[PDB]
Design a protein around this ligand. Structure first.
Ligand code: HEM
Length: 390
């Protein structure tokens, strides 16, 4: 009967003032979480950072936005006990490199431009979620996986159905089984004709050792696609809405287009999508913030609270794209820190730069209070985002 976690905010566009008092008084405390179980709630920036850094806490339940009901071992990272996590991550990171992510900029520009061509070809108003936020990220992954333009239609549909919710338990599993089939065939085809893509590169990676089999490759491909899709789509949808509901910051961006990178980092901090780190368990006794956490006890990082700690940034409640980017914890920290963060940053940069440039006078087609948020314990995004432009 530890107290329930205080609600941080009623809307992602507001400061999370509801968690401030706990963070200030007790940055490591006991709370009861939505499942009805108690765990250590960690909200201070310093302590969340120290928790994520410490391999004494192993992940039991991954970050909520990186998993689907829903899907489908070695190569998945998310659902991986140690020491396989470490070695499988090292294998994947050998080919899914920051270099490979940077190398996708022209692909990302192309994809973003293609989606905006379709949008302005039709006008006006459009739902930015269906036409853009949900569509772009899976097509970037399609390119990462070497999917021919053919070929994209099928990939988009299957990935889309995977995100769909609401779909019933069955419908949900059937979507997962179709994705599984697609990915299995994809792996066979890349074996049959290798290319310059990530899957081809893994098939051919240094593997002493022999862990990279078809199962490993399906697990990695599924994980990256699923992890990249709802996270990035949420950032695009909520980030666009937050900018549109912040005419002060939008004006600063329009006055100084070089702020796009700063704006992406501030949106990441401000929204801290998913709110919590994956639930961890102590594999040994550990002292965190002066508090003894016993082996076997659960620990939940309140990353949103950490990203609003006044010890971390000044006047944290302010949404201010002029800030020099600070090391927020929206991509985590330590061993499980987000492996796709450079890709996410690159995609959001191209997305926001192109959107606001190509659709001058972009604005909400309906007041903000009419937006409908996907919320299930935490916010997953907006259902639709009706927009117009000049
Ligand atoms: C778009 C915004 C994204 C955000 C805000 C985000 C956030 C995070 C966070 C906070 C973690 C750490 C979870 C924890 O320590 O409990 C994480 C891990 C992870 N992320 Fe992301 N992510 C994003 C995009 C992506 C993308 C694009 C990919 C893949 C291309 C991805 C793949 C992963 C994977 C596989 C992990 C687990 C890494 C491991 O367990 O070693 N994420 N992400």
């Amino acid at each position: 009967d530890a107290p329930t976690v205080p609600k941080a905010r009623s809307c992602p566009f507001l400061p999370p003032d509801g968690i401030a008092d706990i963070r200030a008084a007790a940055p490591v405390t006991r709370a009861t979480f939505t499942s009805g179980h108690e765990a250590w709630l960690v909200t201070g920036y310093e302590e969340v950072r120290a928790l994520l850094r410490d391999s004494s806490f192993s992940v039991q339940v991954p970050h909520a936005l990186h998993t689907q009901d829903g899907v489908v071992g070695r190569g998945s990272l998310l659902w991986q006990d140690e020491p396989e996590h470490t070695s499988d991550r090292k294998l994947l990171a050998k080919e899914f490199t920051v270099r490979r992510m940077q190398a996708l900029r022209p692909n990302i520009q192309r994809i973003v431009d293609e989606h905006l061509d379709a949008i302005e070809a039709r006008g006006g108003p459009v739902d930015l979620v269906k036409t853009f936020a949900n569509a772009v990220p899976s097509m970037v992954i399609s390119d990462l996986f070497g999917v021919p333009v053919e070929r994209r239609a099928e990939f988009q549909d299957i990935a889309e159905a995977m995100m769909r919710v609401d779909q019933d338990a069955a419908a949900t599993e059937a979507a997962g089984m179709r994705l599984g089939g697609l990915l299995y065939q994809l792996v066979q085809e890349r074996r049959a004709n290798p290319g310059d893509d990530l899957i081809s590169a893994l098939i051919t990676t240094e593997d002493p050792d022999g862990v990279v089999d078809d199962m490993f490759l399906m697990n990695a491909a599924g994980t990256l696609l699923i992890a990249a899709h709802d996270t990035t789509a949420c950032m695009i949808g909520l980030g666009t809405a937050l900018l549109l509901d912040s005419p002060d910051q939008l004006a600063l961006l329009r006055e100084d287009p070089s702020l796009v990178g700063n704006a992406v980092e501030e949106l990441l901090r401000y929204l801290t999508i998913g709110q919590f780190g994956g639930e961890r368990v102590a594999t040994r006794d550990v002292e965190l913030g002066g508090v003894r956490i016993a082996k076997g006890e659960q620990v939940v990082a309140h990353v949103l609270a950490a990203d609003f700690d006044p010890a971390f940034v000044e006047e944290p409640e302010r949404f201010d794209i002029t800030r020099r980017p600070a090391p927020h914890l929206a991509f985590g920290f330590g061993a499980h820190q987000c492996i796709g963060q450079q890709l996410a940053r690159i995609e959001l940069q191209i997305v926001f730069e192109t959107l606001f440039r190509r659709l001058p006078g972009l604005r909400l087609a309906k007041p903000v209070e009419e937006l409908r948020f996907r919320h299930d314990i935490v916010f997953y995004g907006v259902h639709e985002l009706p927009v117009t432009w000049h």
